[model samples]
Target: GTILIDLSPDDKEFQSVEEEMQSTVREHRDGGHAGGIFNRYNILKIQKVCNKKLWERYTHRRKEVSEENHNHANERMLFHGSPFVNAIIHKGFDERHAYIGGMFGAGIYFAENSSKSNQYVYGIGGGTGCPVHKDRSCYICHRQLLFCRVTLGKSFLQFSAMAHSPPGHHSVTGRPSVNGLALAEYVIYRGEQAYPEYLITYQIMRPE
Candidate 1:
């Protein structure tokens, strides 16, 4: 029921999401992990994406999350940093192209922590999650990030990798990588479990 909507830098909606991202950065600052991620980046732009058919896929799975007597339907706004922005905004998240050696196997990877997502990003200089880079020239600009609405429909929590979500689970969780990356991750095996809501442009913060 929604379409891609460009947001003005100063738009109220844009500011609100920008505020949320900074808050996430602050959340990472309390612990020793603060060494690098604190005040990580400055938000440059936000594009709201509300795909028509993508909704049906995600919503249907969301309703199923309440199945199996679950506690939380667990719909979350998560971060996914990719280099293929156009392919994703149009065709959406796909596991076929997931990072080959993923700690959690071949599935759609998402993080609650922006710092975690930055791992795949070209940040500080160039960004990821942007398919525009198909133009190599496009590859040299602000890093791109996809903020997604993910339906966790009863997730399997573990740090070890698995080829697929277990029999009854809709997704996987509790993913911990090295260092401060222990912030955890939510990985869904199928694309339908997640929907791209916004594409954000950002870069690591530098001295004013």
Candidate 2:
């Protein structure tokens, strides 16, 4: 059961999320080097990615993680920048597709800062049986981003790169780069531990 429910611009939830999307850009952008017109255009909308199959698995995992040493699962809602929402909507997060030798090891990468995640939001094209989404311009092409509810579980915070979660930790949190440490990454080993709760579609307006 897969459904994409689009939120109205006027809806409260949409307003909240819209604010969430812009806040990071607002916070990180310095108006000098970080200067540009980073705005979500009219076609931009936040869609809810719903499927009962992954929901049950994610919840089940959450339950298991919660019991381990009173972990509370450390559940966190994070941002994942991706090109394909079509595959992700049905199959969930795929670890194999993730960067293997990444800064925080092979896992689904998420960023707390929207500006950090937005760079990875380049689109590839369309899914099978759909007209390919042609890129109009590098700076203005519509991009796809995922706002996910990830089960961080017992998180191990580290400052440098790590290949895997050490010992019993369920996830890894680290700051590989520092723009005053605005960008942080959360790494989870398992794919099912995350649910793509919301799919954010927008366009970026870069400096000319």
Candidate 3:
């Protein structure tokens, strides 16, 4: 939606034309194209964050080209509106208590900031076969836990809300959001409860 404009601040005519175009776009007689301002901004920002590698491109196998070339390529790709997905697979999250109430739509976004010694995060979800096994470990992290800003698109709201909510008495009910569901099991993998060992934890919403 962004058009490249060559602007010389001193040129009044260019400024006027640019302003007029912006005005017309804002006037927007049609209903559908609202410019997805928030989503686009968030996606782009996350992409920038993901592409920032600490080592040289050749030093890291996942990075196919030098940083400069990769950045240029990234900008070109951005113009087309591509989607990037990521996820984290680990032992605890798949357990019942951990995978509770996951409602995100796209790939998984992971950031493990804990200080614990074995704080590892595996898997950044994309492409499909079996959710976990079929997915490839993000090429960036040679270790068990990679430190990348995984953008799973818009579904972050669900898990974000769940992560933010506080607990209360089981008997008392106040608001209706993600409140008061009877938690039965201790596993979190989100796999079929009977056979969860092979799966990773993901949250999906169900009807009440």
Assess candidate 2 and give its lDDT.
0.70
Which regions of candidate 3 deviate over 4 angstroms?
Answer: 1-102, 112-143, 149-208
Candidate with maximal TM-score: 2
Q: How many backbone overlaps does candidate 2 show?
A: 1
* Per-model CA lDDT versus the true structure: 0.68, 0.70, 0.20
lDDT by residue (tens digit), candidate 1, 3-42: 6788997799898777766666533423412223335566
Model 1 compared with the native: what TM-score? Answer: 0.75
Provide the TM-score for each candidate, comma-separated. 0.75, 0.81, 0.17
Q: Could you tell me which residue pairs clash in candidate 2?
A: 73-153
What local lDDT does model 2 show for residue 77?
A: 76
Off by over 4 Å in 1: 1-3, 26-38, 69-72, 122-140, 159-162, 175-182
Which tens-of-lDDT digit does each residue in 18-44 have in candidate 3?
Answer: 332222221111221212111000001
Local error of candidate 1 at residue 106 (angstroms): 1.4
Residue 34 displacement (Å), model 3: 42
